[PDB]
Amino acid sequence: PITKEEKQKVIQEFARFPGDTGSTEVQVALLTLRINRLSEHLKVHKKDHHSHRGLLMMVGQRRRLLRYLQREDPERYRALIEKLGIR
Amino acid sequence: KRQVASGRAYIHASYNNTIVTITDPDGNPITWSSGGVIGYKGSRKGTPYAAQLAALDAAKKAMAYGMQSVDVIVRGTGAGREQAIRALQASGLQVKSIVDDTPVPHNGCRPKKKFR
Amino acid sequence: KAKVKATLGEFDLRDYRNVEVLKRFLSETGKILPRRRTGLSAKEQRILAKTIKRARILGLLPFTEKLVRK
Amino acid sequence: MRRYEVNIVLNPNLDQSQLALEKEIIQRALENYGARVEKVEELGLRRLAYPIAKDPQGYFLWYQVEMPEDRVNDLARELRIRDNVRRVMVVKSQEPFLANA
RNA sequence: GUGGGAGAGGGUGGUGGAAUUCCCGGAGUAGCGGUGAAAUGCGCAGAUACCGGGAGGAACGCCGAUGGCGAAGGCAGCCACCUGGUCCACCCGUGACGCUGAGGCGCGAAAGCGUGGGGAGCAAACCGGAUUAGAUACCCGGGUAGUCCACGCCCUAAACGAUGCGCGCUAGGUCUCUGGGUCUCCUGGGGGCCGAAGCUAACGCGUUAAGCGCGCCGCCUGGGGAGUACGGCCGCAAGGC
Ligand SMILES: [Mg+2]
Ligand SMILES: [Mg+2]
Ligand SMILES: [Mg+2]
Ligand SMILES: [Mg+2]
Ligand SMILES: [Mg+2]
Ligand SMILES: [Mg+2]
Ligand SMILES: [Mg+2]
Ligand SMILES: [Mg+2]
Ligand SMILES: [Mg+2]
Ligand SMILES: [Mg+2]
Ligand SMILES: [Mg+2]
Ligand SMILES: [Mg+2]
Ligand SMILES: [Mg+2]
Ligand SMILES: [Mg+2]
Ligand SMILES: [Mg+2]
Ligand SMILES: [Mg+2]
Ligand SMILES: [Mg+2]
Ligand SMILES: [Mg+2]
Ligand SMILES: [Mg+2]
Ligand SMILES: [Mg+2]
Ligand SMILES: [Mg+2]
Ligand SMILES: [Mg+2]
Ligand SMILES: [Mg+2]
Ligand SMILES: [Mg+2]
Ligand SMILES: [Mg+2]
Ligand SMILES: [Mg+2]
Ligand SMILES: [Mg+2]
Ligand SMILES: [Mg+2]
Ligand SMILES: [Mg+2]
Ligand SMILES: [Mg+2]
Ligand SMILES: [Mg+2]
Ligand SMILES: [Mg+2]
Ligand SMILES: [Mg+2]
Ligand SMILES: [Mg+2]
Ligand SMILES: [Mg+2]
Ligand SMILES: [Mg+2]
């Protein structure tokens, strides 16, 4: 799945500053990572519906955080979106 | 015409009948009896007295074959499931051991509407 | 009557290969003993059941047995 | 690469040529699938609780290994294809949960 | 975020034993089965019972609980892989990013439909035997669809806690599942049972509220007619809204 190596790689890649863990940028990055993992898991296993509900909820949370970012600072929002390739 | 001198005795008891099969130490049967082998015909076959008479008749046929030492296997439940073993004990056959090997599944098959 | 854990050492509940101690938790038949007679906690019993099944599939513990004296 | 425990029960009646052959085949299977062998315990002749493949006994082997995950099932299949191997149970390693501590 | 944890949560592949049925063989006679009694039925072409071997399908005994998981439907052999939800401790990061939610979209027991597989046991319809004033039923013997699998439909239910979601507040006691702790105990988070205040027409509810409040959604307005008619939409149909 997602081990501490990949997780820390992504976090240190998307941190606003050294030591930051829960920035909106980092949250959306980790969200999108798990999103892609699950959606690739749902390319196969079309009959796994409960995991699909989990994916729905993850999409919802990511969309809420992106809406908040766009409301607060649009430029950092554009940077995040272009960096992750969404929307 | 066998002179077996020792063997097993299986008691299959149900709520409709009780039957006894006397067999040899490697599984092949020698004699047998049941509530229908003796006079009884209908539900009378399921009474404990019919089970006693069936066990005694099978034991005497085993005497004719020359049986002395007997190991007992029991499968099923019904009236006279125990009376068969009591008569088999007091039949003149030295009972080696009594074993209940009633086959019970691990929930594989669906029973009839009667059994649910 | 004595419960199994009361008379036993500091043993591994996750070792499916130790038949000597896993045999203590089976009944006269191959049935797994209830918590009344094993003296185990819910978590302990839940682990013991799976280890017993593992040992069964490896032919170490009996799937079922025959009752005597009946 | 995760840590696994491979239990192998095979025919007991083998002599030394056959037994060494089957064991080296298991070794080649472990090599071919990237299984680093951490330790080995060979119990051998043991009295089974129920007959397996018409035989009341069996020969036992236990390998603690570290190997990639997505190859474990294919490795188990290749280990099962052998005729003399009657039982194959690969188990993910775990910590020794104790009781009556 | 970090670090731990429990679990029939879901998907995929593998795999184990018990039992039923069937087939091969051995040994073995005269019935078995079934019921309140019986009969149909099966048995001399050798049954039932016993032993050994083989085949196939379906379901997982003990563990098992008054237990656990899930949003609900619902989910129990074992193993591996893929994956969801959730809980606790640390007080680390963001800094109101929240709650609800008409429509939409997805899920949705069983039965039912379509195409193709599969088929042991069970079993609507059906074929017989009984019972009875009659038996179109209950009881017995057979037995097809179906039950099982793949894919696509169907969208119902006593889909029940007959109790929408979220948050705050308001005695405790007892049993329990799962974490943490300086571990007669305390502190979270789930499952029950009594019971303060209070509520209720009463039964009863009572920190798992049916109490005290706030937000938002759904629904109700006498019974029959009737979940019918017409209209629309959805559906291959059954039919559903
Ligand atoms: Mg009868
Ligand atoms: Mg093999
Ligand atoms: Mg599960
Ligand atoms: Mg599963
Ligand atoms: Mg035959
Ligand atoms: Mg005939
Ligand atoms: Mg006839
Ligand atoms: Mg067939
Ligand atoms: Mg139970
Ligand atoms: Mg729950
Ligand atoms: Mg998980
Ligand atoms: Mg802080
Ligand atoms: Mg700040
Ligand atoms: Mg919502
Ligand atoms: Mg809606
Ligand atoms: Mg449905
Ligand atoms: Mg269905
Ligand atoms: Mg169909
Ligand atoms: Mg039937
Ligand atoms: Mg019928
Ligand atoms: Mg008639
Ligand atoms: Mg309300
Ligand atoms: Mg503790
Ligand atoms: Mg509580
Ligand atoms: Mg309580
Ligand atoms: Mg009062
Ligand atoms: Mg109460
Ligand atoms: Mg409340
Ligand atoms: Mg009220
Ligand atoms: Mg209405
Ligand atoms: Mg009116
Ligand atoms: Mg209707
Ligand atoms: Mg009109
Ligand atoms: Mg219409
Ligand atoms: Mg139309
Ligand atoms: Mg209708």
Swiss-Prot record, chain A:
Please provide, in alphabetical order, the Gene Ontology terms of the cellular component aspect for this entry.
cytosolic small ribosomal subunit
In which domain of life is the source organism classified? Bacteria
Instruction: Report the InterPro entries cross-referenced here.
Output: Ribosomal_uS15 (IPR000589), Ribosomal_uS15_bac-type (IPR005290), uS15_NS1_RNA-bd_sf (IPR009068)
Q: Which UniProt keywords apply?
A: Ribonucleoprotein, Ribosomal protein, RNA-binding, rRNA-binding
Q: SMART domains this protein is in?
A: Ribosomal_S15 (SM01387)
Q: Does the keyword RNA-binding apply?
A: yes
Q: Give the family, as the similarity comment puts it.
A: Belongs to the universal ribosomal protein uS15 family.
Matching NCBIfam families? S15_bact
Its function, per the record, reads:
One of the primary rRNA binding proteins, it binds directly to 16S rRNA where it helps nucleate assembly of the platform of the 30S subunit by binding and bridging several RNA helices of the 16S rRNA. Forms an intersubunit bridge (bridge B4) with the 23S rRNA of the 50S subunit in the ribosome.
Q: How does it assemble?
A: Part of the 30S ribosomal subunit. Forms a bridge to the 50S subunit in the 70S ribosome, contacting the 23S rRNA.
- Spell out the protein name for this chain: Small ribosomal subunit protein uS15
| Organism this protein belongs to | Thermus thermophilus (strain ATCC 27634 / DSM 579 / HB8)
Q: What is the lineage of its organism?
A: Bacteria, Thermotogati, Deinococcota, Deinococci, Thermales
The gene for this chain is: rpsO
From Swiss-Prot, chain B:
- Which biological process terms from the Gene Ontology are attached to this UniProt entry? translation
Q: Name one GO cellular component term.
A: ribonucleoprotein complex
Q: What is any Pfam family matched here?
A: Ribosomal_S11
Which keywords annotate this record?
Ribonucleoprotein, Ribosomal protein, RNA-binding, rRNA-binding
Q: Where is the composition biased (Basic residues)?
A: 109-116
Disordered: annotated segments: 99-116
Name the Gene Ontology molecular function terms of this record: rRNA binding; structural constituent of ribosome
From what superkingdom does this record's organism come?
Answer: Bacteria
| Chain coiled-coil ranges | none
Record InterPro entries:
Ribosomal_uS11, Ribosomal_uS11_bac-type, Ribosomal_uS11_CS, Ribosomal_uS11_sf
Q: Does the keyword Repeat apply?
A: no
Q: Which family does it belong to?
A: Belongs to the universal ribosomal protein uS11 family.
What role does it play? Located on the upper part of the platform of the 30S subunit, where it bridges several disparate RNA helices of the 16S rRNA. Forms part of the Shine-Dalgarno cleft in the 70S ribosome, where it interacts both with the Shine-Dalgarno helix and mRNA.
What is known about its subunit structure?
Answer: Part of the 30S ribosomal subunit. Interacts with proteins S7 and S18. Binds to the C-terminus of IF-3; however exactly how IF-3 interacts with the 30S subunit is unclear. May contact the C-terminus of Era.
> Under which name does UniProt file this protein?
Small ribosomal subunit protein uS11
**Organism, per UniProt?**
Thermus thermophilus (strain ATCC 27634 / DSM 579 / HB8)
Q: Which gene encodes it?
A: rpsK
From Swiss-Prot, chain C:
Entry's Gene Ontology molecular function annotations: small ribosomal subunit rRNA binding; structural constituent of ribosome
Q: Mention one GO biological process in which this protein takes part, according to its record.
A: translation
- Specify the superkingdom: Bacteria
Q: Does the keyword Ribosomal protein apply?
A: yes
Q: Which cellular components does GO assign to this protein?
A: ribonucleoprotein complex; ribosome
Write the record's keywords in alphabetical order, separated by commas.
Ribonucleoprotein, Ribosomal protein, RNA-binding, rRNA-binding
Could you say which protein family the record assigns here?
Answer: Belongs to the bacterial ribosomal protein bS18 family.
Q: What does this protein do?
A: Located on the back of the platform of the 30S subunit where it stabilizes the close packing of several RNA helices of the 16S rRNA. Forms part of the Shine-Dalgarno cleft in the 70S ribosome, where it probably interacts with the Shine-Dalgarno helix.
What is its quaternary makeup? Part of the 30S ribosomal subunit. Forms a tight heterodimer with protein bS6, also interacts with protein uS11. Binds to the C-terminus of IF3 and to the central section of Era.
- Under which name does UniProt file this protein? Small ribosomal subunit protein bS18
Organism (species):
Thermus thermophilus (strain ATCC 27634 / DSM 579 / HB8)
UniProtKB/Swiss-Prot annotation, chain D:
Its quaternary organisation is: Part of the 30S ribosomal subunit. Forms a tight heterodimer with protein bS18. May make transient contacts with protein uL2 of the 50S subunit during translation.
NCBIfam families of this UniProt entry? S6
The record's similarity note reads: Belongs to the bacterial ribosomal protein bS6 family.
Tell me what this protein is called: Small ribosomal subunit protein bS6
- State the gene name recorded for this protein: rpsF
Instruction: Enumerate the UniProt keywords alphabetically.
Output: Ribonucleoprotein, Ribosomal protein, RNA-binding, rRNA-binding
Q: State any GO CC term.
A: ribonucleoprotein complex
Q: Which organism is it from?
A: Thermus thermophilus (strain ATCC 27634 / DSM 579 / HB8)
Q: InterPro entries per the record?
A: Ribosomal_bS6, Ribosomal_bS6_CS, Ribosomal_bS6_sf, Ribosomal_S6_plastid/chlpt, Transl_elong_EF1B/ribsomal_bS6
Q: Please give the function described in this protein's UniProt entry.
A: Located on the outer edge of the platform on the body of the 30S subunit.
Pfam families xref list: Ribosomal_S6
Keyword RNA-binding recorded: yes
**Gene Ontology molecular functions:** small ribosomal subunit rRNA binding; structural constituent of ribosome
The record's Gene Ontology biological-process terms are: translation
Q: Which domain of life is it from?
A: Bacteria
